[PDB]
């Protein structure tokens, strides 16, 4: 089972009630210890994908601090080489907190970390409260990848996550070389007396 | 009406009343003079948007 060459830590962070719990169900595997969201601060998910003929394991930490997890949520960004900021385009309050989350990441998370942006529940165009233009403009300033995801518009988050993994692997990978007519016969002693 | 410089002159122009029976301003959304733009809700309940629509 332990065949994956690299283990990347990713944090799925966003405002409470945004819908992260439904979001990761698409690009994650739903088995093992489910729930445990409030037990410590996090719920865990795993994904395996091959990049440049090298297996990569990605572990997703969807932390969420309600009122108790002040220092613990901070400690949970100890070595996250990736992050997946999420907001809902229904209420501008979730979008307004994106800068605060990004500040927490870039202050506490791993140095020079690659971070993306996700707009959930885009199918609900009835109550759209944030435009894509402003989202892209805010993404440009902090060199973040950006997309919008929905249940009906599925399979885009999978491509975005794979693209984020590829971006990480092309930046935290040290180049290696593929290291894989010997003599045969009866030898004769030649050491001096 | 001869209006000299820097002197306001009140003009009276009568109007026939508009009758709601044959205009239906209650349900007639304000035109978007540059359509083909992303839709964003300004945010207004029925009681306020109907008022603003009638005024416009």
UniProtKB/Swiss-Prot annotation, chain A:
Q: List the disulfide bonds.
A: none
Activity regulation comment: Alternates between an inactive form bound to GDP and an active form bound to GTP. Activated by the guanine nucleotide-exchange factor (GEF) TRAPP complex, and inactivated by GTPase-activating protein (GAP) GYP3.
GO MF term set: GTP binding; GTPase activity
Q: Which Pfam families match?
A: Ras
Q: Where is the motif Effector region annotated in this sequence? A: 36-44
Q: Does the keyword Acetylation apply?
A: yes
One GO cellular component term noted in the UniProt record for this chain: endosome
- Main localisation, per the record? Golgi
Question: What biological-process GO terms show up in the record?
Answer: autophagy; early endosome to Golgi transport; exocytosis; protein transport; vesicle-mediated transport
What's the protein's topology in the membrane?
Lipid-anchor
Question: What positions does the entry give for GTP binding?
Answer: 14-21, 62-66, 120-123
Q: Which domain of life is it from?
A: Eukaryota
Q: Which UniProt keywords apply?
A: Acetylation, Autophagy, Exocytosis, Golgi apparatus, GTP-binding, Lipoprotein, Membrane, Nucleotide-binding, Prenylation, Protein transport, Transport
* Biological function: Required for protein transport through the secretory pathway. Probably involved in regulation of secretory vesicle formation at the trans-Golgi compartment. Mediates the proper polarized localization of SEC2, a GEF for SEC4, but does not alter the exchange activity of SEC2 on SEC4. Plays a role in autophagy.
Which family is this protein grouped under? Belongs to the small GTPase superfamily. Rab family.
Q: How does it assemble?
A: Interacts with YIF1, YIP3, YIP4 and YIP5. Interacts with the GEF SEC2. Interacts with TRS130.
**Misc remark for this entry?**
Present with 4298 molecules/cell in log phase SD medium.
Note the PANTHER family from the entry.
Answer: DRAB11-RELATED
Q: What is this protein called?
A: GTP-binding protein YPT32/YPT11
Specify the species.
Answer: Saccharomyces cerevisiae (strain ATCC 204508 / S288c) (Baker's yeast)
**Gene name tied to this protein:** YPT32
UniProtKB/Swiss-Prot annotation, chain B:
Q: Which family does it belong to?
A: Belongs to the TRS120 family.
Q: How does it assemble?
A: Part of the multisubunit TRAPP (transport protein particle) II complex composed of BET3, BET5, TRS20, TRS23, TRS31, TRS33, TRS65, TRS120 and TRS130. Interacts directly with TRS65.
Where does this polypeptide localize?
A: Golgi apparatus, cis-Golgi network
Q: Which residues of the full protein are shown?
A: 1066 to 1121 of 1289
Origin organism of this chain? Saccharomyces cerevisiae (strain ATCC 204508 / S288c) (Baker's yeast)
Record's function text: Specific subunit of the TRAPP II complex, a highly conserved vesicle tethering complex that functions in the late Golgi as a guanine nucleotide exchanger (GEF) for the Golgi YPT1 GTPase. TRS120 plays a role in the YPT GEF activity of TRAPP II in concert with the two other TRAPP II-specific subunits TRS65 and TRS130.
* Miscellaneous note of the record: Present with 259 molecules/cell in log phase SD medium.
Q: What is this protein called?
A: Trafficking protein particle complex II-specific subunit 120
